[PDB]
RNA sequence: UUGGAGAGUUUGAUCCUGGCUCAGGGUGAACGCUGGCGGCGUGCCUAAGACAUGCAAGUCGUGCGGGCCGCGGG
């Protein structure tokens, strides 16, 4: 099993004659607090199905984040559309310093020490993905040498 | 590398741009409601407007010559 957090749940709507009709959107991150996180956004005619379906995709999309004493190996900046995420290495005491969105991802990934900043569009969805694709580009001292 | 959190609000809904707004810290402060004690600070930011009264720069007889009161005594 995995540990799960609901980052976002939103109602959307579409028009047709006679009225508007809703659908729900569930941004869920899921992880083991020991180097494995997954982000999934799930939509359905009702709330919990969406939260379920979210969690489903969440697993069907993971990433192996190279923790290091609970911090990430290096500075990293990523832009997903107009959203930007900054990740910066932090020493033992620091805590996770971030907004909920990139927090929820970093805690459930087992980060315990990091400095972050959102820049640009701070739409949670895009920020979510931007933080994921960020982690996904983390490299270790090894990773680099093997590569080169 | 001791360091970096964001949120509300444009739409039926969306993403973006973009302003407004907020939570933080700060002060020679002021206003309200309330008000027990102590310590260290600290208190005319405006009229460099106008000020009653006291006080804030004096001292030396080991520079000099006198006055006035007294002490010692012809
Ligand atoms: Mg890896
Ligand atoms: Mg974006
Ligand atoms: Mg851009
Ligand atoms: Mg280091
Ligand atoms: Mg925002
Ligand atoms: Mg409005
Ligand atoms: Mg418009
Ligand atoms: Mg509205
Ligand atoms: Mg805004
Ligand atoms: Mg008062
Ligand atoms: Mg009173
Ligand atoms: Mg006093
Ligand atoms: Mg003055
Ligand atoms: Mg005048
Ligand atoms: Mg006058
Ligand atoms: Mg005096
Ligand atoms: Mg002399």
What distance in angstroms lies between residue A61's CA and the mean position of ligand 17's atoms? 103
CA distance A142 to A123: 34
Method by which this entry was solved: X-ray
> What is the edge-to-edge ordering of all strands in the sheet holding A3-16?
A3-16, A19-31, A36-44, A62-64
Separation between the CA of A132 and the C1’ of B63 (whole angstroms):
98
Sorted by sequence, the CB contacts under 8 Å of residue A141 that are 6+ apart come out as: A73
Separation between the CA of A57 and the C1’ of B15 (whole angstroms):
22
Question: What DSSP assignment string belongs to A58-107?
Answer: HHTSEEE---BTTB-SS-EEEEETTEEEEEEE--TT--EES-HHHHHHHH
Q: Rounded to 5 degrees, what are φ and ψ at A66? A: -65, 65
Structure resolution, Å = 2.9
**CA count, 13 A, side-chain hemisphere, A6:** 14
DSSP secondary structure letter of residue A113: S
């Amino acid at each position: 099993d995995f540990e799960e957090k609901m980052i976002l749940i939103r109602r959307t709507a579409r028009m047709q004659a006679g009225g508007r009709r809703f659908r729900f959107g569930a941004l869920v991150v899921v992880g083991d607090r020991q180097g494995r996180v997954g982000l999934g956004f799930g939509k359905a005619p009702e709330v919990p199905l969406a939260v379920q379906k979210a969690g489903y995709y969440a697993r069907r999309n993971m990433v192996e984040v190279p923790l290091q004493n609970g911090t990430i190996p290096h500075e990293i900046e990523v832009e997903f559309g107009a959203s930007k995420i900054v990740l910066k290495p932090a020493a033992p005491g620091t805590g996770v310093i971030a907004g909920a969105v990139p927090r929820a991802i970093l805690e459930l990934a087992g980060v315990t020490d990091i400095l972050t900043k959102e820049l640009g569009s701070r739409n949670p969805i895009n920020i979510a993905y931007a933080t994921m694709e960020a982690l996904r580009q983390l490299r270790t001292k090894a990773d680099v040498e093997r590569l080169r």
